[PDB]
């Protein structure tokens, strides 16, 4: 179920993020960011779901945290606010976090959505969250309504947009398309 670190690494490389990508991390951010270089990373917040994306723009001095569930989990939000502050202390500034949900609650596509955000960051680091060709494919919904029936079609359309984007941009995804689709499916966690 979900996506492995090696899957995500292969897709991020296909998407052209390699020059800025620091790796995949277990629970913690990367050790440091540099005042001189764009950087991004994927963090497993649990230690094949629980994926969040990190990015850093040294020119705007902005850290981005992309979370498909809009930081609707208050403990997760608290943890990573502190991680941000600690990262700045190790590195010697603004944090922009997701505020709306783009993924269905029964989906296991978290890691894939993080890859899509990293494409957006690598290409439009001045505006990675929204108002760019990649993220404009995806629509956020209010967190309080994440579990409401009426938003599920929007969250499903987001996932369809995600898969179609990956088919166009990632040879790895094409080579593993049916497998990854099955493992990450929109209702992987609901069978009613
Ligand atoms: Na969008």
């Amino acid at each position: 179920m979900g996506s492995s670190e090696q899957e995500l690494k292969a897709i991020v490389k296909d998407l052209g993020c390699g020059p800025y990508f620091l790796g995949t991390y277990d629970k913690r951010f990367p050790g440091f960011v540099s005042p001189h270089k764009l950087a991004c990373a994927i963090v497993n917040t649990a230690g094949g779901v629980h994926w969040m994306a990190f990015a850093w723009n040294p020119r705007s001095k902005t850290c981005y945290l992309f979370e498909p569930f809009g930081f609707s989990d208050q403990r997760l939000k608290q943890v990573y606010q502190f991680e941000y502050e600690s990262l700045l202390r190790r590195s010697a500034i603004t944090l922009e976090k997701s505020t709306q949900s783009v993924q269905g609650p029964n989906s296991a596509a978290c890691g894939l959505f993080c890859c899509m955000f990293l494409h957006a960051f690598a290409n439009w680091p001045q505006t990675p969250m929204d108002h760019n060709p990649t993220m404009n494919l995806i629509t956020g919904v209010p967190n309080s309504m994440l579990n409401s029936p009426q938003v599920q079609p929007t969250l499903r359309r987001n996932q369809e947009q995600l898969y179609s984007f990956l088919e166009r941009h990632s040879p790895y995804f094409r080579s593993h398309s049916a497998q990854i689709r099955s493992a990450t499916s929109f209702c992987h966690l609901k069978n009613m």
Side-chain angles (χ1 to χ4, degrees):
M1 150 153 223
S3 301
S4 66
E5 65 166 77
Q6 297 78 8
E7 168 177 310
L8 305 183
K9 288 177 162 168
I11 293 170
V12 158
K13 174 169 176 75
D14 281 350
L15 294 177
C17 321
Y20 310 125
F21 187 62
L22 302 181
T24 51
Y25 289 84
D26 271 338
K27 301 179 258 253
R28 297 197 148 184
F29 296 158
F32 75 96
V33 290
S34 165
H36 302 331
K37 304 192 277 216
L38 288 163
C40 64
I42 291 174
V43 177
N44 191 285
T45 68
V49 288
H50 307 108
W51 295 110
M52 174 186 64
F54 167 87
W56 162 250
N57 183 332
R59 186 175 183 267
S60 67
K61 295 207 182 258
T62 304
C63 177
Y64 297 93
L65 294 175
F66 172 84
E67 202 289 288
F69 293 95
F71 285 108
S72 55
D73 174 340
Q74 62 78 202
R75 178 59 182 141
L76 183 71
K77 191 182 184 174
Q78 181 169 239
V79 166
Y80 288 102
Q81 179 77 40
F82 197 106
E83 285 302 297
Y84 158 75
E85 293 156 354
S86 295
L87 169 69
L88 299 181
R89 285 189 281 262
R90 295 190 301 272
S91 299
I93 322 316
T94 297
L95 176 66
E96 185 169 313
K97 294 188 295 287
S98 297
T99 58
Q100 292 191 319
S101 294
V102 298
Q103 180 175 329
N106 305 114
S107 172
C110 45
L112 300 179
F113 278 116
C114 287
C115 294
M116 186 175 189
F117 170 76
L118 290 189
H119 177 91
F121 174 74
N123 286 282
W124 306 279
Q126 73 280 17
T127 184
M129 294 300 293
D130 192 3
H131 300 114
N132 68 67
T134 295
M135 295 309 291
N136 288 179
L137 294 170
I138 304 306
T139 303
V141 312
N143 292 344
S144 57
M145 296 290 171
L146 175 64
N147 301 285
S148 73
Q150 72 195 84
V151 303
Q152 305 307 307
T154 296
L155 300 177
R156 180 189 297 279
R157 280 190 288 268
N158 288 345
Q159 189 142 340
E160 294 167 358
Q161 299 276 76
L162 169 67
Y163 291 145
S164 171
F165 173 88
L166 295 173
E167 297 278 13
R168 286 195 184 176
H169 294 92
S170 174
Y172 183 91
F173 184 90
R174 294 196 291 280
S175 293
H176 302 86
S177 173
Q179 301 84 336
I180 294 173
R181 286 167 179 270
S182 174
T184 62
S185 76
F186 179 73
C187 279
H188 208 89
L189 283 115
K190 185 211 196 322
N191 195 33
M192 23 190 263

